[PDB]
Design an enzyme around this catalytic site. Structure first.
Site, mmCIF file in Angstrom:
data_model
loop_
_atom_site.group_PDB
_atom_site.id
_atom_site.type_symbol
_atom_site.label_atom_id
_atom_site.label_comp_id
_atom_site.label_asym_id
_atom_site.label_seq_id
_atom_site.Cartn_x
_atom_site.Cartn_y
_atom_site.Cartn_z
ATOM 1 C CG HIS B 75 75.116 76.602 90.128
ATOM 2 N ND1 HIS B 75 74.334 76.758 89.119
ATOM 3 C CD2 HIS B 75 75.771 78.097 90.985
ATOM 4 C CE1 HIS B 75 73.483 78.577 89.098
ATOM 5 N NE2 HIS B 75 75.035 78.883 89.685
ATOM 6 C CG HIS B 79 80.531 77.914 91.396
ATOM 7 N ND1 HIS B 79 80.854 79.121 90.902
ATOM 8 C CD2 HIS B 79 79.239 78.619 92.170
ATOM 9 C CE1 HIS B 79 80.025 79.969 91.551
ATOM 10 N NE2 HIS B 79 79.149 79.749 91.717
ATOM 11 C CG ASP B 116 76.770 77.801 94.557
ATOM 12 O OD1 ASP B 116 75.072 78.559 95.209
ATOM 13 O OD2 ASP B 116 77.417 78.209 93.698
ATOM 14 C CG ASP B 233 78.715 83.392 94.207
ATOM 15 O OD1 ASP B 233 78.990 82.239 92.913
ATOM 16 O OD2 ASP B 233 77.170 82.990 94.371
ATOM 17 C CG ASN B 236 82.636 82.628 87.018
ATOM 18 O OD1 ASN B 236 81.892 81.704 86.564
ATOM 19 N ND2 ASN B 236 83.596 82.334 87.691
ATOM 20 C CG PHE B 287 76.269 88.835 83.967
ATOM 21 C CD1 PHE B 287 75.335 88.985 85.264
ATOM 22 C CD2 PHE B 287 77.887 87.519 84.464
ATOM 23 C CE1 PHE B 287 75.976 88.679 86.334
ATOM 24 C CE2 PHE B 287 77.374 87.583 85.158
ATOM 25 C CZ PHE B 287 76.786 87.725 86.294
#
Ligand SMILES: CCc1oc2ccccc2c1C(=O)c1cc(Br)c(O)c(Br)c1
Ligand SMILES: CCc1oc2ccccc2c1C(=O)c1cc(Br)c(O)c(Br)c1
Ligand SMILES: [Mg+2]
Ligand SMILES: [Mg+2]
Ligand SMILES: [Zn+2]
Ligand SMILES: [Zn+2]
Lengths: 326, 326
Positions: B75, B79, B116, B233, B236, B287
């Site tokens: 973070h 990012h 963030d 967000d 990835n 995930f």
């Protein structure tokens, strides 16, 4: 030391709607929040139930009271004491006997005590429109109410102020969540939704065999506590007129002072804040008709008929303020 | 000095999924957030549409980038750039061609850059369970995300940092509200509800005969932007494998560092944060299976079929990580 005897005599009405909260404020040396909170904690045996040391309770209460502004006419320590005592009476209503746990009772009373702490005497919208540090911190969302919570909890960390020191970790976590949920519900931007859910609960009311309210999940339990503290927050017009009129004088001074600041800054004056064009009587009637009576009539249905005397005083006070218009 | 020409040729594909952000990060002296935002602002002609002095844009973006922690592995500022560029590409989606106005485009982009900022490398639950000052300030509610917003807006009050100085007061008020609504939606506690509102919208999708989406009310419009920046967000696992693997090494370092703090303090270990019992690869497949793919497949349907490439790459990387499991 007979003044303490007079204060103790007045504190015998702590279970009564219409407590002389302004006289208690005078008799206690501008400590209505401390003496009323202490008296209620004794009445409900809360110092023994949660092992709260007496000295720690008084030290927190005096510290909390200190962080209410003595120079704001309405949102001060007297108002906090009034909301605390009003919530205390509402908790004792027969339709809710034994319904809430000792932790939920503790949370509702604690939430009432802190619910306006460090109020500057101006509204959320004023803090938003003036780009205040508070509105910046809290991203324009329930700005005051988030602040009240943060201050109320932070003061527990001052020395000998942790009145929750002997609660278990799960008790503190549960209480903290309930207090947050309750104080955030005092934001008037949540009023319409809060009342819509209260009406739904009335229409779908369930009662146990003992005759008390049936609340078998956190959602219904916390909604009743939210509306309870909300009703106590908006309880001024349900009080005997000599109390109601002083609260009205006080909130109008706070509104007018805000409107004068909105004028010094070239801003649009908020409704009922322009002292050069405001009707105090017509605003109270509209406040009762559109907000306070719908709320209290709905609460009265929930605990029918326990709140009939409170609803009668509200309707009498509305009739009276109305009569001052012609 | 050959890096600036190297830095130039990588930015050419700022409109494509899979930008070499880590190369761009190293080629720019650890300033990828500044150079990616600026390149996107020129690509979408935002400095001219909103009258933004380009020097003021650089002064704030560098101040904003400095408030991302250099000692946090995920973070941080890299990012922040990747979410910005991913949001930029999702905005250029053909089925969303010019659906959002210029201010709504500036809202999702500015929100991505600050979303963030000042992240300490630990989760909201860690901050809550450790009685952090942040959780105390924000009453356990979207603690990090409220803070990110408060910092990102506060920095505008620095010298030559108000990049919205020439927006109208209504534009600034509208931009503030949308930025808040978007960054608050990056809280993962809102994921299921955000996905559900994306589910219901898919079932009620109304489009042209060239297929593009029709959003009339602000509620439907903001929900698309919320799910959009949320998709960026969580973009990835949808990037090329070499980028995805670098992001995974960084987030697992941040997780393991939190789990070590959860151990030296003696608290329960957050899932996937115990280095002595973590399966990095299984966690990624899970995930993807339970969060990233249901989100991107619901997003793909709403944009049918402009997200098939992204959905295919995600399924490819899920297949590769699964293959790494013996
Ligand atoms: C927003 C409509 C409204 O109009 C009024 C006119 C007179 C008195 C109260 C109100 C009132 C409120 O609901 C109200 C509720 C709370 Br809680 C306050 O802390 C304050 Br301040 C005002
Ligand atoms: C909560 C389940 C979950 O498990 C993971 C395993 C690997 C990588 C991400 C995640 C993940 C997330 O949803 C997530 C989302 C955001 Br936004 C973050 O800032 C972080 Br940190 C984690
Ligand atoms: Mg209040
Ligand atoms: Mg985040
Ligand atoms: Zn109040
Ligand atoms: Zn992020």
């Amino acid at each position: 030391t007979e003044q303490e005897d007079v204060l103790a005599k007045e504190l015998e009405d702590v279970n009564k709607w219409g407590l002389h909260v302004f006289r208690i404020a005078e008799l206690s040396g501008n400590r209505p929040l401390t003496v009323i909170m202490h008296t209620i904690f004794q009445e409900r045996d809360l110092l023994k139930t949660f092992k709260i040391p007496v000295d720690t309770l008084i030290t927190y209460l005096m510290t909390l009271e200190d962080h209410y502004h003595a120079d704001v006419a309405y949102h001060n320590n007297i108002h906090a004491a009034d909301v605390v005592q009003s919530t205390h009476v509402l908790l004792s209503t027969p339709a809710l006997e034994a319904v809430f746990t000792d932790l939920e009772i503790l949370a509702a009373i604690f939430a009432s005590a802190i619910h306006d702490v460090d109020h500057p005497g101006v509204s959320n919208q004023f803090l938003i429109n003036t780009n205040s540090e508070l509105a910046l911190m809290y991203n324009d969302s329930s700005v005051l109410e988030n602040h009240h919570l943060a201050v109320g909890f932070k003061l527990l960390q001052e020395e000998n102020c942790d009145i929750f020191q002997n609660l278990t970790k799960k008790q503190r976590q549960s209480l903290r969540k309930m207090v947050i949920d309750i104080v955030l519900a005092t934001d008037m931007s949540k009023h319409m939704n809060l009342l819509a859910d209260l009406k739904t609960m009335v229409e779908t009311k369930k009662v146990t065999s003992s005759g008390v309210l049936l609340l078998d999940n956190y959602s219904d339990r916390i909604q009743v506590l939210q509306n309870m503290v909300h009703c106590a927050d908006l309880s001024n017009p349900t009080k005997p007129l000599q109390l109601y009129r002083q609260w009205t004088d006080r909130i109008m001074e706070e509104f007018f002072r805000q409107g004068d600041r909105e004028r010094e800054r070239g801003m649009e004056i908020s409704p009922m804040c322009d002292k050069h064009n405001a009707s105090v009587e017509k605003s109270q009637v509209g406040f009762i008709d559109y907000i306070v009576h719908p709320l209290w009539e709905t609460w009265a249905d929930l605990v029918h008929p326990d709140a009939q005397d409170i609803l009668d005083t509200l309707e009498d006070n509305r009739e009276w303020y109305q009569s001052t218009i012609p």
